[PDB]
Amino acid sequence: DIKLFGKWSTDDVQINDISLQDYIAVKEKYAKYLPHSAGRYAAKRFRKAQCPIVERLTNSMMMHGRNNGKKLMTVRIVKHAFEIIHLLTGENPLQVLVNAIINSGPREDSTRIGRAGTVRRQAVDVSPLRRVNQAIWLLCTGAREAAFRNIKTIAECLADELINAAKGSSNSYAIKKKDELERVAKSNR
Amino acid sequence: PVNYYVDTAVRHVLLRQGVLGIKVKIMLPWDPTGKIGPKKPLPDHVSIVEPKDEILPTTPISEQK
Amino acid sequence: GRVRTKTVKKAARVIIEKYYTRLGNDFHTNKRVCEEIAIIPSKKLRNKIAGYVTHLMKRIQRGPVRGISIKLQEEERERRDNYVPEVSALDQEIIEVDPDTKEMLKLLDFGSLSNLQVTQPTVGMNFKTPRG
Amino acid sequence: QPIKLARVTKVLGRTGSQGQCTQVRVEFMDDTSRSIIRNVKGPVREGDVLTLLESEREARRL
Amino acid sequence: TEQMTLRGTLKGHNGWVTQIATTPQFPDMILSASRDKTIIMWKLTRDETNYGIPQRALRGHSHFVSDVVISSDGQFALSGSWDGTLRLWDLTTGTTTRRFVGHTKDVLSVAFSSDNRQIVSGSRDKTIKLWNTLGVCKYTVQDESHSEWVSCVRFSPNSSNPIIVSCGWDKLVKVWNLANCKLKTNHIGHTGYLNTVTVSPDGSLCASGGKDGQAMLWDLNEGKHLYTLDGGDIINALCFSPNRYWLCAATGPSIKIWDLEGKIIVDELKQEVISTSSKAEPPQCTSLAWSADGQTLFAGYTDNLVRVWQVTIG
Amino acid sequence: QSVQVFGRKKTATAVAHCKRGNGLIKVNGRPLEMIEPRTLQYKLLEPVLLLGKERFAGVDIRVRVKGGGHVAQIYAIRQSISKALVAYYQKYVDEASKKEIKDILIQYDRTLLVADPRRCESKKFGGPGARARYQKSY
RNA sequence: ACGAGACUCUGGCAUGCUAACUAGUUACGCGACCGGUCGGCGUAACUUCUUAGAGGGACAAGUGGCGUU
């Protein structure tokens, strides 16, 4: 009975990725009314995995200078586009967001050469936490530059971005970037 | 402690070829009440009281007064 | 970094060596003891000294410490070191002896010893580590 | 080749030009008896699961 | 014949249980003092889930609470604390009725006279003070007192010859006459500092213990040493059984009961499940209090639990 | 029967006077569902939503709040209300009810009962703020 | 031995102490509106809120691992 905003439950959300189950916090101790909790999750390493995923998205929305610190605006932008994901798909918006997080996180990518090197790149595996972080960052960036210089409002660009990422469609900026990174890692194997 | 354990003075001396600068710093001794120096000890100085020599009672003696 | 400075450590060592009887495993009693028996002009320094005294009390609880030297503790330590087995390890019914030391004992005039058992000597003269 | 998971059993060290990769030991979730060393890029801790798309290379020791 | 077994454990303290107080007026009421700056008034349900639950929490001390004692009627409580002050609490409302100021150091012990007309406070100030119930200090034994901390002060339950017995960290047991508050008797013989003294319910014996581990019994009327029982650790507390001729000592992490007749160990109360976590020291018994009827003994420990033992015969 | 237990966040501080009553909750004379941002209304309703109207039914709570910022006055009001109910239950009901309400509140959010110690850091010369520095050129 | 640390100032905690018409809060009276809202008026309680003094409080102290243990 701790539905988000006041409408979205969490009891039905299934992560079903095993790898990211411990790093997406949505279900029972992480069911909160609002994606705004002050919180001190940056004080110690790995704690941000205890932060609810909706609050992580909300924090990632405050970007590009003019929107720094405006968290009430971002919680409004999440409340909308949850109201819109529900209308477009008919599913729980939390489930759509979780599926988007699963689909948009890279599994491999390239670093500078192995132990050492200054010429090419070497493929490596991605931590689950870095997977979730990169997924949130890519989803937010795709929404941000879909809404820029366009009559389409934010909370519409973000809703469609999350829906496409949940579907796995290539109309999503996050899915395109994930595929690009994974392919480059493949080439540098 | 530099603000109450060392007393500093700077002075000029007008000589034929120019000015000589003199600086004098004195580190005062610890003075308990008597003004030769500061009353407070240095903050890093720990003094441990020497334990008095006691004799462990071999047998229970009761003293009535 | 919680590394204690030499001020704290030497103060704690002296306090322990002088007042070992009054101290224990309790930080909050140890700090009162320190503030009663010593003159520490700061509360934080007193707390650091008491904490290290507690740590060292725990350390001496399970043996000795290279810094401390308690006069009364050494008596009990040598009392533990005074262990004596029932039968001396040097009292053996039969002791093996090589032919060479048997000949040496015979030359000593002690060839009449009975406990000696003349064991067989080694065969191969291979007692050196190979070079390379 | 299929995609398969592996649980981290111990963090070996830090590698890379700028120390950006954690070289780690992983045991496979299904087999549970075969283990390898791989470099993982990001913050890693005990017991988390890495999905390997390729699953038979070995990271170079140290 | 008569053995004691563990019946229950009382939870609710966040710090070491430093004193347990019972009264012969409310058999379902217990006061426990603790290092969490709080005194818990329990309610003895004696049900299956728990022996007792916290009913009220007396707060107002700014440091550890070292001793708590209940009046003759279960309506008032007296507490001493490391904040240097003493507090007289009304047990119905749970608020401090009176505050006793005057000690410059930690207050280690406190006692209420039988008539509940006098109060004795012994402090780390090496000082024993007398108070009325109105919070006024009458006498202060600054001289001819302990040269070290005063660890425990106790009244004598004898209507005749009013004596107060005190112990200090100077390894001395001092007996003072309540009439004039001068040193009547001085007792030597302890090797280490003393923690507690217990006065017999009839006022005939006084037991003392501490670091040395030896529980020494002294005659109170005649003033001489009687018998030194051997404890295997530091004696944190002592108490006589109200009815049986027993003495119980909180010896380290255990408690031992001796029959004062046979002068032999009657029981060894030790409760600790030993496992791979044995690398840490077991919790130490700190306080001991017998029930009004005498069939129950409450023990405080470092793990902030109060364990109740019952004489299960058997 | 009253407690007056208060709570803080940053510079904002709110004092909640909780007395024996019939379930009134006001903040600065206004009812609870009228505080300003109204995006964090659920942040104000968290105590009563977690504990239920039955537990507040025997008390009237009046909160006076002053200090810095809308989002700090919120979190100060909710801390004050939670701590006021806890203290009233402790002083006037029993320890068991206090234990259960404290357990619920602490399990949901520690900041509902224990104040956040974070405060603004000072500015040092050579930069626009606490740790930022002015641009360096060569 | 100097430097580092210690130190001083400062930030957080105290329903414990000291005490306030140049700070208040409760309570009670008198008023204004529809029990409620009164930076409306006035005077008892008192110190939670405000001030600022003294003291307390944290020490890697407790537990589990890693370490020459």
From Swiss-Prot, chain B:
<comment type="function">
    <text>Component of the small ribosomal subunit. The ribosome is a large ribonucleoprotein complex responsible for the synthesis of proteins in the cell. Has endonuclease activity and plays a role in repair of damaged DNA. Cleaves phosphodiester bonds of DNAs containing altered bases with broad specificity and cleaves supercoiled DNA more efficiently than relaxed DNA. Displays high binding affinity for 7,8-dihydro-8-oxoguanine (8-oxoG), a common DNA lesion caused by reactive oxygen species (ROS). Has also been shown to bind with similar affinity to intact and damaged DNA.</text>
</comment>
<protein>
    <recommendedName>
        <fullName>Small ribosomal subunit protein uS3</fullName>
    </recommendedName>
</protein>
<feature type="modified residue" description="Phosphoserine; by IKKB">
    <location>
        <position position="47"/>
    </location>
</feature>
<comment type="subunit">
    <text>Component of the 40S small ribosomal subunit. Identified in a IGF2BP1-dependent mRNP granule complex containing untranslated mRNAs. Interacts with HNRPD. Interacts with PRMT1; the interaction methylates RPS3. Interacts with SUMO1; the interaction sumoylates RPS3. Interacts with UBC9. Interacts with CDK1; the interaction phosphorylates RPS3. Interacts with PRKCD; the interaction phosphorylates RPS3. Interacts with PKB/AKT; the interaction phosphorylates RPS3.</text>
</comment>
<feature type="modified residue" description="Phosphothreonine; by CDK1 and PKC/PRKCD">
    <location>
        <position position="59"/>
    </location>
</feature>
<comment type="similarity">
    <text>Belongs to the universal ribosomal protein uS3 family.</text>
</comment>
<feature type="modified residue" description="Phosphoserine">
    <location>
        <position position="62"/>
    </location>
</feature>
<feature type="cross-link" description="Glycyl lysine isopeptide (Lys-Gly) (interchain with G-Cter in ubiquitin); alternate">
    <location>
        <position position="52"/>
    </location>
</feature>
<feature type="cross-link" description="Glycyl lysine isopeptide (Lys-Gly) (interchain with G-Cter in ubiquitin)">
    <location>
        <position position="40"/>
    </location>
</feature>
<feature type="cross-link" description="Glycyl lysine isopeptide (Lys-Gly) (interchain with G-Cter in SUMO2); alternate">
    <location>
        <position position="52"/>
    </location>
</feature>
<feature type="modified residue" description="Phosphothreonine">
    <location>
        <position position="58"/>
    </location>
</feature>
UniProtKB/Swiss-Prot annotation, chain C:
<keyword id="KW-0687">Ribonucleoprotein</keyword>
<keyword id="KW-1024">Diamond-Blackfan anemia</keyword>
<dbReference type="GO" id="GO:0005737">
    <property type="term" value="C:cytoplasm"/>
</dbReference>
<keyword id="KW-0597">Phosphoprotein</keyword>
<keyword id="KW-0689">Ribosomal protein</keyword>
<keyword id="KW-0963">Cytoplasm</keyword>
<dbReference type="Pfam" id="PF00833">
    <property type="entry name" value="Ribosomal_S17e"/>
</dbReference>
<keyword id="KW-0539">Nucleus</keyword>
<comment type="similarity">
    <text>Belongs to the eukaryotic ribosomal protein eS17 family.</text>
</comment>
<dbReference type="InterPro" id="IPR001210">
    <property type="entry name" value="Ribosomal_eS17"/>
</dbReference>
<dbReference type="GO" id="GO:0005730">
    <property type="term" value="C:nucleolus"/>
</dbReference>
<dbReference type="GO" id="GO:0005654">
    <property type="term" value="C:nucleoplasm"/>
</dbReference>
UniProtKB/Swiss-Prot annotation, chain E:
<feature type="repeat" description="WD 4">
    <location>
        <begin position="145"/>
        <end position="177"/>
    </location>
</feature>
<dbReference type="InterPro" id="IPR020472">
    <property type="entry name" value="G-protein_beta_WD-40_rep"/>
</dbReference>
<comment type="function">
    <text>(Microbial infection) Binds to Y.pseudotuberculosis yopK which leads to inhibition of phagocytosis and survival of bacteria following infection of host cells.</text>
</comment>
<dbReference type="GO" id="GO:0051726">
    <property type="term" value="P:regulation of cell cycle"/>
</dbReference>
<feature type="modified residue" description="Phosphoserine; by viral VacV B1 kinase">
    <location>
        <position position="278"/>
    </location>
</feature>
<dbReference type="GO" id="GO:0030971">
    <property type="term" value="F:receptor tyrosine kinase binding"/>
</dbReference>
<keyword id="KW-0217">Developmental protein</keyword>
<keyword id="KW-0597">Phosphoprotein</keyword>
<dbReference type="GO" id="GO:0001934">
    <property type="term" value="P:positive regulation of protein phosphorylation"/>
</dbReference>
<dbReference type="GO" id="GO:0030291">
    <property type="term" value="F:protein serine/threonine kinase inhibitor activity"/>
</dbReference>
<dbReference type="GO" id="GO:0051898">
    <property type="term" value="P:negative regulation of phosphatidylinositol 3-kinase/protein kinase B signal transduction"/>
</dbReference>
<comment type="subunit">
    <text>(Microbial infection) Interacts with Y.pseudotuberculosis yopK.</text>
</comment>
Curated annotation (Swiss-Prot), chain F:
<keyword id="KW-0007">Acetylation</keyword>
<dbReference type="GO" id="GO:0032040">
    <property type="term" value="C:small-subunit processome"/>
</dbReference>
<keyword id="KW-0963">Cytoplasm</keyword>
<dbReference type="GO" id="GO:0006364">
    <property type="term" value="P:rRNA processing"/>
</dbReference>
<dbReference type="GO" id="GO:0003723">
    <property type="term" value="F:RNA binding"/>
</dbReference>
<feature type="modified residue" description="N6-acetyllysine">
    <location>
        <position position="53"/>
    </location>
</feature>
<keyword id="KW-0539">Nucleus</keyword>
<dbReference type="GO" id="GO:0042274">
    <property type="term" value="P:ribosomal small subunit biogenesis"/>
</dbReference>
<dbReference type="GO" id="GO:0070062">
    <property type="term" value="C:extracellular exosome"/>
</dbReference>
<dbReference type="GO" id="GO:0006412">
    <property type="term" value="P:translation"/>
</dbReference>
<dbReference type="GO" id="GO:0015935">
    <property type="term" value="C:small ribosomal subunit"/>
</dbReference>
<dbReference type="GO" id="GO:1990830">
    <property type="term" value="P:cellular response to leukemia inhibitory factor"/>
</dbReference>
